[PDB]
């Protein structure tokens, strides 16, 4: 009862999944071999872990990659005994940062087996609540295979919600030449089939890690730990009791005002170093004030350019409803946060009793209070415009089109995807432009 199925695709998705399942094992006290020696803990494991007669707890997770390297790393790693062997799926060769290769030619062999594994897990579940998908748009395997799997799962389980946590290409930083083609190709599929997708930018988390943790040169481990913290904060409402709980469906109903507009931005607070944590008291009001600043947003754009349409605050730790009511009143008073006129009440609050869990040897300081905000705004249209410019500038000369055409993709798909992204940007700018009574 009250469980969700998690899917990890590509290298980014798999590594983030290792970070997330390490965090969940730490939160529920499950030692990595699966045993559980140790009253929310007596039921919270049922959300993410399934139990067997021997007392072992197995993740409800599936790991897929068309190349074997990362899956072999986790097979040899610390958590090798945690995951059931059938969950870990391997292809034979990566998509080579090619959407067509990931989707059409190579993904067809593995998609049937992946769907069979998901079907087995869903049959095991009763009272299933959702679908968490972790991938990256820039990759070939991530983009193509996630597009294929989301369309298949939308056909199979269309009456159930699906959540996405995707890594977005930065405006300047990049690690692949053909990122725009893969990203614009997969925006249509995620827009059509995803119920709520959360956007991530590596450069934003680099800046956040610099500013708030003093790390001069962080790595993917820290960013994946932060992603794990955000998703754990989202799922804590189901996993644990609270004074004001929010379910995934009611959360989506609050946050999503229109069908296509389902791309909120995520932020977390208080992110602080262990050196600076002692100095500041970290009250609810200052946590709420810090959570709204531009510099803490994890997609590199200023919300001051855009307009906020709906906000969802998820507090965990010692919190009282007065404090958050006063904090939201104070935030509504400030004019830098411009909410849309047509939405009178733009905030939904949830409170949870359990404090955030701190990983051993992590950079983030222990704190008795924490908040995670999911906010729908028009600022992401700027990042979409930047990516569209980066796409069309090279598409005008047909920069790398023959590689995609060789794998069965048609040239018209690029134009159709560009038209779809143009329509989405026009919708996003249209809804927030103005209103008259």
């Amino acid at each position: 009862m009250r469980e969700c199925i998690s899917i990890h695709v590509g290298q980014a998705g798999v590594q983030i999944g290792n970070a997330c399942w390490e965090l969940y094992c730490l939160e529920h006290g499950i030692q990595p071999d699966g045993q559980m020696p140790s009253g929310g803990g007596d039921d919270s494991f049922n959300t993410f872990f399934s139990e067997t007669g021997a007392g072992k707890h197995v993740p409800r997770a599936v790991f897929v990659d068309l190349e074997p390297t990362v899956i072999d790393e986790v097979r040899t790693g610390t958590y090798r005994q945690l995951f059931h062997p059938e969950q870990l799926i391997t292809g034979k060769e990566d998509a080579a940062n090619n959407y067509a290769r990931g989707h059409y030619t190579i993904g067809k062999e593995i998609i049937d087996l992946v769907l069979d594994r998901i079907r087995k897990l869903a049959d095991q579940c009763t009272g299933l609540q959702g679908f968490l998908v972790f991938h990256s748009f820039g990759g070939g395997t991530g983009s193509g295979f996630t597009s294929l799997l989301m369309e298949r799962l939308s056909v199979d389980y269309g009456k159930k919600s699906k959540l996405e946590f995707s890594i977005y290409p930065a405006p300047q930083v990049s690690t692949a030449v053909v990122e725009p083609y893969n990203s614009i190709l997969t925006t249509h599929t995620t827009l059509e089939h995803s119920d709520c997708a959360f956007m991530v930018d590596n450069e934003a988390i680099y800046d956040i890690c610099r500013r708030n943790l003093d790390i001069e040169r962080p790595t993917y481990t820290n960013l994946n730990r932060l992603i794990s913290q955000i998703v754990s904060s989202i799922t804590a409402s189901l996993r644990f009791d609270g004074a004001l709980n929010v379910d995934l469906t009611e959360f989506q109903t609050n946050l999503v005002p229109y069908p296509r507009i389902h791309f909120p931005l995520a932020t977390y607070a208080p992110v602080i170093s262990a050196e600076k944590a002692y100095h500041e008291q970290l009250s609810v009001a200052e946590i709420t004030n810090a959570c709204f600043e531009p510099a803490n947003q994890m997609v590199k754009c200023d919300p001051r350019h855009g307009k906020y349409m709906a906000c969802c605050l998820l507090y965990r730790g010692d919190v009282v409803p007065k404090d958050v009511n006063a904090a939201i009143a104070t935030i509504k008073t400030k004019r830098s946060i411009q909410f849309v006129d047509w939405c009178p009440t733009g905030f939904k609050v949830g409170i949870n009793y359990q404090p955030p869990t701190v990983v051993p040897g992590g950079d983030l300081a222990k704190v008795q209070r924490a908040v995670c905000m999911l906010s729908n705004t028009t600022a992401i249209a700027e990042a979409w415009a930047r990516l569209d410019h980066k796409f069309d500038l090279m598409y005008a000369k047909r920069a790398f089109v023959h590689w995609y055409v060789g794998e069965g993709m048609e040239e018209g798909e690029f134009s159709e995807a560009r038209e779809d992204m143009a329509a989405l940007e026009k919708d996003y700018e249209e809804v927030g432009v103005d209103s008259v009574e």
């Binding site: 690690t175 040169r217 920069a399 790398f400």
Partner: protein, 429 residues
């Protein structure tokens, strides 16, 4: 899994392949006897990429050695790792083919190509999941250029979908050791442009210049040059063998680097490179590595990148580093050297990171560059070819073997078209 079949043609290719297998055996911890005596499980985790396993733990290379003259085969068999190779994979003739492309391609090579393809087919059907081929050859010779082009064409017929990579030593106007090099190189380029996915041009002049100015070697010999080329060859294929934070398959590299299907002629490079005295005073970090690779004088071909523009760049880093440093440094390189990168690609740079550095070094990096400056080598080769062909200088030797002047004119026209396309995309805006 994801195997590579290695092929060696001519004296230069055989020597470079010997140094390559020496380096790879040192990396994986394999004796000349072939027994494994490494120190980590990662070496055995993907030993199958380059080696096949025998009964008693002996690992045999998946190498094919070809040369029409058996002196090079005797030298390789008598070498330090000569015991490691399979005796059946030594295919050779009885006459060194002169320096005649016609003799290497048509008359002499026709007999040996059947046996070579038989051994290649045996090795390839022995593979669990073949990824591609590798071939070492010198374009100036007869045996190397001619029979390598013939073998490449026939392998492309047999295995059209697989990757085929070449590491080609181009003639140079200052280390010319043979009179008839322009004919052989011109005839080889027409086959190379069509029947290969990736080709890596190498210059003996650039290698000697690196050895003199950077390494300060007093009397460099071919061993050091082959060691540098083997370092590059080991560098490009790390992601298949060892884990890393970002993995670059050969197909991934090809997709990133090749915008248009005929622009696959790359310029390699390697860093760090230093003298023994300077190694002490040197600071060894990612900014130093990036600056060293993007320096022109570290490039492996006698060309200035400053003349042309970089269509694409790839950097395969090895060791443990924070890839934020890689990203910010490489963005800084792109910004501060914007005029040398084409406008019609926003980010010209691909990055990969592998955890294991090479042989005691704290870190290393292999640089690949697809640039418009590569046309200069073909320009000078075409000039020499035209100067010789105006008077029909040495054509009777080739027509005695069976060639025709129509093929010479076609090869010249094909090289002209290649440099025309490169100049077109240089001038594009």
């Amino acid at each position: 899994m994801r195997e590579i079949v290695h092929i060696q043609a001519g004296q230069c290719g055989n020597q470079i392949g010997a140094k390559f297998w020496e380096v790879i055996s040192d990396e994986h911890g394999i004796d000349p006897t072939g027994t494994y005596h490494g120190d980590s499980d990662l070496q055995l985790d993907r030993i199958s990429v380059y080696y096949n396993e025998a009964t008693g733990g002996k690992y045999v290379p998946r190498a094919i050695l070809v040369d029409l003259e058996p002196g090079t085969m005797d030298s390789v068999r008598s070498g330090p790792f000569g015991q490691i190779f399979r005796p059946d994979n030594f295919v050779f003739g009885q006459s060194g083919a002169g320096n005649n492309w016609a003799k290497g391609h048509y008359t002499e090579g026709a007999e040996l190509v059947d046996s070579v393809l038989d051994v290649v087919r045996k090795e390839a059907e022995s593979c669990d999941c073949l990824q591609g081929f590798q071939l070492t050859h010198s374009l100036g010779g007869g045996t190397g250029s001619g029979m390598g082009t013939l073998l490449i064409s026939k392998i492309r017929e047999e295995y059209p979908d697989r990757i085929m990579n070449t590491f080609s030593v181009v003639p140079s106007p200052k280390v010319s050791d043979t009179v008839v090099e322009p004919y052989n190189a011109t005839l080889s380029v027409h086959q190379l442009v069509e029947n290969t996915d990736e080709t890596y041009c190498i210059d003996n002049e650039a290698l000697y210049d690196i050895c003199f100015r950077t390494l300060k070697l007093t009397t460099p010999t071919y061993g050091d040059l082959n060691h540098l080329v083997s370092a590059t060859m080991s560098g490009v294929t790390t992601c298949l063998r060892f884990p890393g934070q970002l993995n670059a398959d050969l197909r991934k590299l090809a997709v990133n680097m090749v915008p248009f299907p005929r622009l696959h002629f790359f310029m390699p490079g390697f860093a760090p490179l230093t003298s023994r005295g300077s190694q002490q005073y040197r600071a060894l970090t990612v900014p130093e590595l990036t600056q060293q690779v993007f320096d022109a004088k570290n490039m492996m071909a006698a060309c200035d990148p400053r003349h042309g523009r970089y269509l694409t760049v790839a950097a395969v880093f090895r060791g443990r580093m924070s890839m934020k440093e890689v990203d910010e440094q490489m963005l800084n390189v792109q910004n501060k050297n914007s005029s040398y990168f084409v406008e019609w690609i926003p980010n010209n740079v691909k990055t990969a990171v592998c955890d294991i550095p090479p042989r005691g070094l704290k870190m290393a990096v292999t640089f690949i560059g697809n640039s418009t400056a590569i046309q200069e080598l073909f320009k000078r080769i075409s000039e020499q070819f035209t100067a010789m062909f105006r008077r029909k200088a040495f054509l009777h030797w080739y027509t005695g073997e069976g060639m025709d002047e129509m093929e010479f004119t076609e090869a010249e026209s094909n090289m002209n078209d290649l440099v025309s396309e490169y100049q077109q995309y240089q001038d594009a805006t």
